[PDB]
Amino acid sequence: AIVNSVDTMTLTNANVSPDGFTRAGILVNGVHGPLIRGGKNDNFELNVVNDLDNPTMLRPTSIHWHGLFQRGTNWADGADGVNQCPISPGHAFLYKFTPAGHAGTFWYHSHFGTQYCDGLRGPMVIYDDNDPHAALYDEDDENTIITLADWYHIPAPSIQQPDATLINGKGRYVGGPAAELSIVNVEQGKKYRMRLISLSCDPNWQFSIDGHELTIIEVDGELTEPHTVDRLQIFTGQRYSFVLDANQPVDNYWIRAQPNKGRNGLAGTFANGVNSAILRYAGAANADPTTSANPNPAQLNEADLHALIDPAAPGIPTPGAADVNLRFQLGFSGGRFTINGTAYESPSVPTLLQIMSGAQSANDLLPAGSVYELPRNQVVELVVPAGVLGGPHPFHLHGHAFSVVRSAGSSTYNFVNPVKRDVVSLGVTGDEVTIRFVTDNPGPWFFHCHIEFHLMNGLAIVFAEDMANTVDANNPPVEWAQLCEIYDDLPPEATSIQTV
Ligand SMILES: [Cu+2]
Ligand SMILES: [Cu+2]
Ligand SMILES: [Cu+2]
Secondary structure, three states: OEOOOOOEEEEEEEEOOOOOOOEEEEEEEOOOOEEEEOOOOEEEEEEEEEEEOOOOOOOOEEEEOOOOOOOOOHHOOOOOOOOOOEEEEOOOOEHHHHHHOEEEEEEEEEEOOHHHHHOOEEEEEEEOOOOOOOOHHHOOOOOOEEEHHHHHOOOEEEEEOOOEEEEEOOOOEOOOOOOOOOOEEOOOOOOEEEEEOOOOOOEEEEEEEEEOEEEEEEEEEEEEEEEEEEEEOOOOOEEEEEEEEEEOOOOEEEEEEEEEHHHHHHHOOHHHOOOEEEEEEEEOOOOOOHHHHHHOOOEEOOHHOOOOOOOOOOOOOOOOOOOOEEEOOOEEEEEEEOOOOOOOOOOOOOOHHHHHHHHHHHHHHHOOOOOEEOOOOOOOEEEEOOOOOOOOOOOEOOOEEEEEEEEEOOOOOOOOOOOOOHHHHHHHOOOEEEEEEEEEOEEEEEEEEOOOOHHOOOOOEEEOOOOHHHHHHOOOOOHHHHHHHHHHHOOOOOOOOOOO
C-alpha cells in the first residue's frame, strides 16, 4: 500500500469492485491507488513499469505528479504531448525529480487520454521537517488522508456521470449492494491534519463532516492562515489540509462528499450510504452513524483564503498591470472546446523535444494556435472568463502555483495576500478569474481544464516558458527521447482499443 520516494510502480490490469460492482481497472503494485510519500528535500526515483495489457482501457501511459513544479526536470512532468511521449506496454521509465523544499498535499495520475478515470491515480504527500502549522495538530500520517474519486462502471474509452463517489477507495452506487464504507479513525481530544484530495476526472464535491468543522491550513500544496468552515466545494485535482479537532462526543459521524453530477440521482442524495464514509471515534460502536449535517453551514469562499508565506501577489497591484497580460476566450464550436478559436490537439512530437531539437520561438512549435511563448522572469497575469458550457471548469497550470488575485463570485481583487494554488474554478458567466505567477521555470507547461473529457475535447493551451534557457535548465536521460521512438514504432494491436 505505500510507494516510497525511491521505488518501482508496476502498472497492471485487474478486476476491481470498489462499490460492489465488478469491472476491469488498473492497479499500482497490486493495489488500487496507493499513497506515494516522501520528504520535501527527497530525490525521488520512481521506475514506472507499464505492464498494462487490457485493451478495453488505454495501454500506453504517462504519469503527472500534480503540484510539483519540476524546475529543471520538465521531462518528468508527465503530460503526454508536452513533456514526454507515453511509456509503452512492456517498457518502463524512470522518473527522477525533487520537491526542492516544497512540502504539501499532491497526487499522481496518468496524463495520457482519460486513463486516470480508470483508477490510475493516487495520493502523494510530501512532509515538511519544519512545518509552520505543526503546533495545530497531533497527528498527520497515512491514516489522516481522505481521497475523493469519481467511479464509473464502464472503462473510460467506452463512456457514452459517475456511478459512485469513492472515499478512500470505497463507496456505494444508487441501487447497489451495501459495499463496505471507508472508516477514518480518530481519538477524542486529539487534532489531525486531514489531507483531502480530489482525484476526480470530472465532478466536484460538497464536502462536510457531521458535527465537525474544517480548519483549512493548506490549499493545493500552499500554506494558508487557518480558516475554518463547515463545508467546502472541491474541484478536480484540488487539495486541502484541514485540522480536524475531534472535540465531539465519542460516536460515529458521517463524512459526506456530494457530487455535482452522477447516475440515478447520486448528485442529490446520501440514501443507503452513497457519497459517504465514516468518521469513527475510538470507543464508538462498529455501526453506521445516525448523525445529520449542520443545517446552516459556513461555506468556503476561496476569496476568504489567504496565503501564509510570501503572501503578496507578484507585480504591480493593479488589474492588468503585470508584465505579460493575457486574456483567454474559451469557446465551444463544432463539437470541440476552443481557446482563442483553437481546439487543442496533441502534436506528433512533444513540446519539450521540439524545443530540444531546435525550435527557437513559439512560432516554430506545434500545434499551431495552442502554444503561447512566455518571457523569462516576468510577472504574468491570466484572465479566463467563465461562460463556456460544461462548467464550472477548474483549470490547472503545470510548473507553477499561482496567486488567485480574483476568484469566482468576487468582483474584488486581492494583491496583498490572496491564496496561492494550482487548480482554480473559473466559476459561472460573469466571473473573470484572474491569476498571477512569475516565469521562473524554463520549459513547456500545460494549462488546461482538468475535467478530463474537456481536455480531451480541446480545452487546453501550452506555455513555452523561457525557451532560450530551456535546454540549459533541463537534462533528460537518454531513455527520455527514446520513449517517442519506441512509441511511434508500436504495432496496431499494441494500441488498439476494444470498445465495450
Ligand atoms: Cu492533475
Ligand atoms: Cu472544463
Ligand atoms: Cu495537466
